């Protein structure tokens, strides 16, 4: 009985919660009330199996058990159209179908929060319903959210209400908290989506190369054999979470945090503090801990990789143990390199041995490898330096606007909502990393730039619209940033004159947050470019500044919705002239 094992291993709470999460990630347009019943049924069942492994269907696989329950409510397509054919197939084809249908941008009501009183009352009335509704809303909206991490966020989301609702000034204790969570929740999600996309589009070898590089940078004192073992379990952990196997994903992540801690001294010295912490805090911690100190006396790489006369022999025997070895050794000595740079170096190195290990004499052509690593190394450093300086000058908001323009000219076919969401996120690179010494910059930035660009890749894949996007996205994971950076203004672009209907800001824009208000402005700016790309100098930066005044002004003219509309009527003409 697999459901019995898992239910035992995890405990009625986390079992029950990850079930809710798996269904919500599968049937996103499905009502909370419907999911609660299905989890209750799946649970009452699990229990019969814990009491008797030989009972009715206790020998069944989780996916089988799970889809029959989902299918009791999916084959009513007047509610969920497409999700009805998956229930016509059977395992393992049905799950494969379900996964294939996860939506990255569901067409769901923007979730808004009630006043603090509203929320704190509800919370006290029934914190379980209150907390179930949270897992659910976050789950259906982020279909690839690392299940285990979601249980952590839920722990913290609970302690905010428990604590802040007692407080004297609740609204003040609480508000900043929901904001940190909401923000770091999105970040976790973006990062997990990149791991799944590695696996699913590019393959397990791809993910492995990244985990090897990554961990090696984090545990430079660990041995290759050690690091390899961790990479093997890490991978398994994500495969499961990325394929819908969340109860098992969690169960194995729990075991890996344990192994890690148990072999603490052979892995890293910064771990001790994590290993004291409760289960969910320990795994999050370990997952995000800083890099250990590098070994005092480590040799020169060149000696075993490009000096030893047995490089080709050693390469050929087992190429994949050797190649990961190089990456390990190279990674651990350079925590100053973005992980995507490191992988670009291995890849070079590899194709370099393909060509040299067959030529007359190997020693003379690969003798130059680190020469070829050079330009690969400067380009990123020179881009971050260039994008960082601009940031200090413009400031976040205008740094994004500059990037909005830059990417909007690049990939003009892309949806505006998308160009806005991705560019705002790209613009947030300046604030996370420029505030680091020239050393820490590359890994913070480049890698971060990779988690965002994948966000674009997935959002555009849904409704493919621009070849170049698909090109840069599909061609190679490791080269996505360079691909997009090397792209230039699309001269193939066919503009859409000017819509009267979409440059009309309304008075209700004065009741929205200053964030949303910036999104309305930026949306229009994207639309400006989608009309006049040809000649867009500083003049654009100017045309935008009017609307800022236009909103600020008309938001306070004590008008009858007049000046807001009517100024727009005259100003839309002005902008057209530009």
UniProtKB/Swiss-Prot annotation:
SMART domains referenced in this protein's UniProt entry, alphabetically: ALBUMIN
Site positions per UniProt: Aspirin-acetylated lysine: 195
Effect on the protein upon substituting residue 556 to E: In Church bay
Disulfide topology: 49-58, 71-87, 86-97, 120-165, 164-173, 196-242, 241-249, 261-275, 274-285, 312-357, 356-365, 388-434, 433-444, 457-473, 472-483, 510-555, 554-563
One example of a Gene Ontology biological process annotation: cellular response to calcium ion starvation
Binding site residues for Ca(2+) 1: 2, 240, 245, 248
Biological role stated in the UniProt entry: Binds water, Ca(2+), Na(+), K(+), fatty acids, hormones, bilirubin and drugs. Its main function is the regulation of the colloidal osmotic pressure of blood. Major zinc transporter in plasma, typically binds about 80% of all plasma zinc. Major calcium and magnesium transporter in plasma, binds approximately 45% of circulating calcium and magnesium in plasma. Potentially has more than two calcium-binding sites and might additionally bind calcium in a non-specific manner.
Disease named in the record: Hyperthyroxinemia, familial dysalbuminemic: A disorder characterized by abnormally elevated levels of total serum thyroxine (T4) in euthyroid patients. It is due to abnormal serum albumin that binds T4 with enhanced affinity. Analbuminemia: A rare autosomal recessive disorder manifested by the presence of a very low amount of circulating serum albumin. Affected individuals manifest mild edema, hypotension, fatigue, and, occasionally, lower body lipodystrophy (mainly in adult females). The most common biochemical finding is hyperlipidemia, with a significant increase in the total and LDL cholesterol concentrations, but normal concentrations of HDL cholesterol and triglycerides.
Protein name: Albumin
Higher taxonomy: Eukaryota, Metazoa, Chordata, Craniata, Vertebrata
């Amino acid at each position: 009985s697999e459901v019995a094992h898992r239910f035992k291993d995890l405990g009625e709470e986390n079992f029950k919660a990850l079930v809710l999460i798996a269904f919500a990630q599968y049937l996103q347009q499905c009502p909370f009330e419907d999911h609660v019943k299905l989890v209750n049924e799946v649970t009452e069942f699990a229990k019969t199996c814990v009491a008797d492994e030989s009972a009715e269907n206790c020998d069944k696989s989780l996916h089988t058990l799970f889809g029959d329950k989902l299918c009791t409510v999916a084959t009513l397509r007047e509610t969920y159209g497409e999700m009805a054919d998956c229930c016509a197939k059977q395992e393992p084809e049905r799950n494969e179908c379900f996964l294939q249908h996860k939506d990255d941008n569901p067409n769901l009501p923007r979730l808004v929060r009630p006043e603090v009183d509203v929320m704190c009352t509800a919370f006290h009335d029934n914190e379980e319903t209150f907390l179930k509704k949270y897992l659910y809303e976050i789950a259906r909206r982020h279909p690839y959210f690392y299940a285990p991490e979601l249980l952590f966020f839920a722990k913290r989301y609970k302690a905010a209400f428990t604590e802040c609702c007692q407080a004297a000034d609740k609204a003040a204790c609480l508000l900043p908290k929901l904001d940190e969570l909401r923000d770091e929740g999105k970040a976790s999600s973006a990062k997990q989506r990149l791991k799944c996309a590695s696996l699913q589009k590019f393959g397990e070898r791809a993910f492995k190369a990244w985990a090897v590089a990554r961990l090696s940078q984090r545990f430079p004192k660990a041995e290759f054999a050690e690091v390899s073992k961790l990479v093997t379990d890490l991978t398994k952990v994500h495969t499961e979470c990325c394929h819908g196997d969340l109860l098992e994903c969690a169960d194995d992540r729990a075991d890996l945090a344990k192994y890690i801690c148990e072999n603490q001294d052979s892995i890293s010295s910064k771990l001790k503090e994590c290993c004291e912490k409760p289960l969910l805090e320990k795994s999050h911690c370990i997952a995000e801990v800083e890099n250990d100190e590098m070994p005092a006396d480590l040799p020169s790489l060149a000696a075993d990789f490009v000096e030893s006369k047995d490089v080709c022999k050693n390469y050929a025997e087992a190429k994949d143990v050797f190649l990961g070895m190089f990456l390990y050794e190279y990674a651990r000595r350079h925590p100053d390199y973005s992980v995507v740079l490191l992988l670009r170096l291995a890849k070079t190195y590899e194709t370099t041995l393909e060509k040299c290990c067959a030529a007359a004499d190997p020693h003379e052509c690969y003798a130059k490898v680190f020469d070829e690593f050079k330009p690969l190394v400067e380009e990123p450093q020179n881009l971050i330096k260039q994008n960082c300086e601009l940031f200090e000058q413009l400031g976040e908001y205008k740094f994004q606007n500059a990037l909005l323009v830059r990417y909007t000219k690049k990939v003009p076919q892309v949806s505006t909502p998308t160009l806005v969401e991705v560019s705002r996120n790209l613009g947030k690179v300046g604030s996370k990393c420029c505030k680091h010494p020239e050393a820490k910059r590359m890994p913070c930035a480049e890698d971060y730039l990779s988690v965002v660009l994948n966000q674009l890749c997935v959002l555009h894949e849904k409704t493919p619209v621009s070849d170049r996007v698909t090109k840069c996205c599909t061609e190679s994971l490791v080269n996505r940033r360079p691909c997009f950076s090397a792209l230039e203004v699309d001269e193939t672009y066919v503009p859409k004159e000017f819509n009267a209907e979409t440059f009309t800001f309304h008075a209700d824009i004065c009741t929205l947050s200053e964030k949303e208000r910036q999104i309305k402005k930026q949306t229009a700016l994207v639309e400006l470019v989608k009309h006049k790309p040809k000649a867009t100098k500083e003049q654009l930066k100017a045309v935008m500044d009017d609307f800022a005044a236009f909103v600020e002004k008309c938001c306070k003219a004590d008008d009858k919705e007049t000046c807001f509309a009517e100024e727009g009527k005259k100003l839309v003409a002005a902008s057209q002239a530009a």
